[PDB]
């Protein structure tokens, strides 16, 4: 039994725990969200397949690590799905070839939020996997740990729906111009979806966001969002009706709005949060 990652780096087998760096592409699916498919990341082979046949299972106590430590889910192992954290040992994968075959493992997450996400940074631990290696010819039976680290910055979707972007940046035309905000949303299966805006408001009506621009900033103006010509105030539920696998625009448009007093020349900036809810 010998393994290597996608980039050809060898995984030392046995000894202490191994730090295995892998790529993530988290997506929502029906009834579960994918954190990582290791079958494209880890590949393994047998050097004496004619005489020796290697067996490898996933031992119980394999669980998420780091920011994901908190979550539960499943692990699809060799076509079958099992709860994750693993409560019992999985069935074995056979390694009877000198040709590198992938390690058929995919880590899933049970949806808990509407459209939430967890930031996962490059270099951070995401799972702690305990493996048990045996063979068909002698009594060698050994366990070792594979700490799975992320090789790229991603955001694991913790809900039934996924946003087109976690950080949107729009540029307003010069005052008093407006511009649409590019942002859509979709769900694994149909969800009666809505959302509301949050952030620091300038007015009592909670419909204008404060200008937090630092350098040569404008006075007397803030940012205000509209949808179909209708002003959207903060902490106000916007219904999107039924949202399915097809992306549905939020319909949001950015605008300027006077906050009161003389309007003076300068930069304008406003950070506005969007939070999704079920209905």
């Amino acid at each position: 039994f010998a393994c290597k990652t996608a980039n050809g780096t060898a995984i030392p087998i046995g000894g202490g725990s191994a730090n295995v760096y892998v790529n993530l592409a988290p997506v929502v699916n029906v009834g579960q969200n994918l954190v990582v498919d290791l079958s494209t990341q880890i590949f393994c082979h047998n050097d004496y397949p004619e005489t020796i046949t290697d067996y490898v299972t996933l031992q119980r106590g394999s669980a998420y690590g780091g920011v994901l430590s908190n979550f539960s889910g499943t692990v699809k192992y060799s076509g079958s799905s099992y709860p994750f954290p693993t409560t019992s040992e999985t069935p074995r994968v056979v390694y009877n070839s000198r040709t590198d075959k992938p390690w058929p493992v995919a880590l899933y997450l049970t949806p808990v939020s509407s459209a939430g996400g967890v930031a996962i940074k490059a270099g951070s631990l995401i799972a702690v996997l305990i493996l048990r290696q045996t063979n068909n010819y002698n009594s060698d039976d050994f366990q070792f740990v594979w700490n799975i680290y992320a090789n790229n910055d991603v955001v694991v979707p913790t809900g039934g729906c996924d946003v087109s972007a976690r950080d949107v940046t729009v540029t307003l035309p010069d005052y008093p111009g407006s511009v649409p905000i590019p942002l859509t949303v979709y769900c694994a299966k149909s969800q009666n979806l809505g959302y509301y805006l949050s952030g620091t408001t300038a007015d009592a009506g909670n419909s204008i966001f404060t200008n937090t621009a630092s350098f040569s900033p404008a006075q007397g103006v803030g940012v205000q969002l509209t949808r179909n010509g209708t002003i959207i105030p903060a902490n106000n539920t916007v219904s999107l009706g039924a949202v399915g696998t097809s992306a549905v625009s939020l319909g949001l448009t950015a605008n300027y709005a006077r906050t009161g007093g003389q309007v003076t020349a300068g930069n304008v900036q406003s950070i506005i949060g969007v939070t999704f809810v079920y209905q």
Binding site: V163, D167, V170, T171, L172, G266, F276
Partner: peptide, 12 residues
């Protein structure tokens, strides 16, 4: 929040 919209603008 789920998404963060940073609006940039100018008053000339």
């Amino acid at each position: 929040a789920d998404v963060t919209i940073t609006v940039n603008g100018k008053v000339v």
